[PDB]
Symmetry: C2
Subunit: 305 residues, 2 copies
């Protein structure tokens, strides 16, 4: 037993990380088959980032201006193209460590593992959630751009995130692997509103189920509620509205624990209105929303890869 | 910026995980050079675990009774020996993926990454601390025995933990890679007191420094204290006594932030006596003690491997 915020094993992604240099700028790239993917602002100086014209800046670059290094291996760049906010560098060698992979665009509230990298070298791995406002609260220092987020299903890596920007508020923004930003953000050093974030309600409920499975039961109350009544409370506390789709996804956890979803909603309502009175749930003094229902089932069942 | 509980990249350890079967019992093993390391209770049935005589049980085992499988590879066992609580299975093939490695016995309060495995396959990775009472609060289901804990320094993996037991209280116990248990525990299914745990004071202080570096400053107070006065408070709240060695380890963080250690101790004293008044520090509603001072410096500096 026990419940931890667990990342996927990072080995399959470690073998894909390379370093990309253009001029004075160095960041991380992702080497899959004979293409290296990286943030297009590798072509920007610090001064370019205030108001970059990427088309004009890229025209001034040729294949030989992009230095791609995989450990000690220098990769030969034979083509370059810009797709949305990512650069695709065609190289003359297929990465022999390319795993089975997909590019996916995840939904807000879904979770993934980030392999934080600097200069093409992995520094650590952690699990996080895409916030409802399409930011992530990561750990990204200078040079971490190009680090990727991923999920693994058996032997297949689903890449869902590439890091591009730290907003002035300290939260993080990035793209899918086709270079389309999550949320309204752009790769320019300017003020950018993220807009109101909310708590991922279905994830909180999943984690309450994880707590019951592990023996933390004090929050179980004698009340029930309705979907519409619960959502009146959810709106007041800036929680995502719960839908029947969410109720359906919690089905297996409800069946394992014998606790109807709306009963768990009533316990969560009482937690929202009365606080936690200095108690903890699974070692946390606040309601945790970074576990999806699938995450809870995975961890409580021991799914491997 | 941002601060996350980050595990080491697990790739170098993934390549060492194998499955070990003896009779009906299957668990994880660690394959380094031509030796596979695993918990000796792989030779026990469920009934053996109530009161096992490992010497007598092992005598009834021969080399061909140990099935060692690395993915799809079947390893040939050519010798077996028991070292304390671990079995060493000599195999006829050196693991071609053996990293540079050390076996280390860590101190209480130090942190490491766990690669949770089942049937020899990695399921996830997470960072945890060795508690002062020599337990860990992990995520370990049936079959996770033999999963290992490690740190990485550049290209060298320092193995410090192998999982053996879930205590009746739900916390976890294990050995170093020489098979010596951390703490008073034994590999027998019986009641085992862990004894009073305490909070890792130097880690809490390191995390307060991490918070200041990332802009969370509300807890900074106008008081100072003394080492002896602070420890009077530490004893009352079941915190580890702070020593000058701990003050010395916090030196670099004190110098970066311009906050004297005893000033930070005074802020922590006020947090202990008055609580956090419904506020958070680095997104946490309790005082976090699973980051060492070295962990904070690593993450705030971007050290890679």
């Amino acid at each position: 037993s026990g419940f931890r915020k667990m990342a996927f094993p990072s080995g399959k992604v470690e073998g894909c990380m390379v370093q990309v240099t253009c001029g004075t700028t160095t960041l991380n790239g992702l080497w899959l088959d004979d293409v290296v993917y990286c943030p297009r602002h590798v072509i920007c100086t610090s001064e370019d980032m205030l108001n970059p014209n990427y088309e004009d800046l890229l025209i001034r670059k040729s294949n030989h201006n992009f230095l791609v290094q995989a450990g000690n291996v220098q990769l030969r760049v034979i083509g370059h193209s810009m797709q949305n906010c990512v650069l695709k560098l065609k190289v003359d060698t297929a990465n022999p460590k390319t795993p089975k992979y997909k590019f996916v665009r995840i939904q807000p509230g879904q979770t993934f593992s980030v392999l934080a990298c600097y200069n093409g070298s992995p520094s650590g791995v952690y699990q996080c959630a895409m916030r409802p406002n399409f930011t992530i609260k990561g750990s990204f220092l200078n040079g971490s751009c190009g680090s990727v987020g991923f999920n693994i299903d058996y032997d297949c890596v689903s890449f869902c995130y590439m890091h591009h920007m730290e907003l002035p508020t300290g939260v993080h923004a990035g793209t899918d692997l086709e270079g389309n930003f999550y949320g309204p953000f752009v790769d320019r050093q300017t003020a950018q509103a993220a807009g109101t974030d909310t708590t991922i309600t279905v994830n909180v409920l999943a984690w309450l189920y994880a707590a019951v499975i592990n023996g933390d039961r004090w929050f179980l109350n004698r009340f029930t509620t309705t979907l519409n009544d619960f959502n009146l409370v959810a709106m007041k506390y800036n929680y995502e509205p719960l839908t029947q789709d969410h109720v359906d996804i919690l089905g297996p956890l409800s069946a394992q624990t014998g606790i109807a979803v709306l009963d768990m909603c009533a316990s969560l309502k009482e937690l929202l209105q009365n606080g936690m009175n200095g108690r903890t749930i699974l070692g946390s003094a606040l309601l945790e929303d970074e576990f999806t229902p699938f995450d809870v089932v995975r961890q409580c069942s021991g799914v491997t890869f």
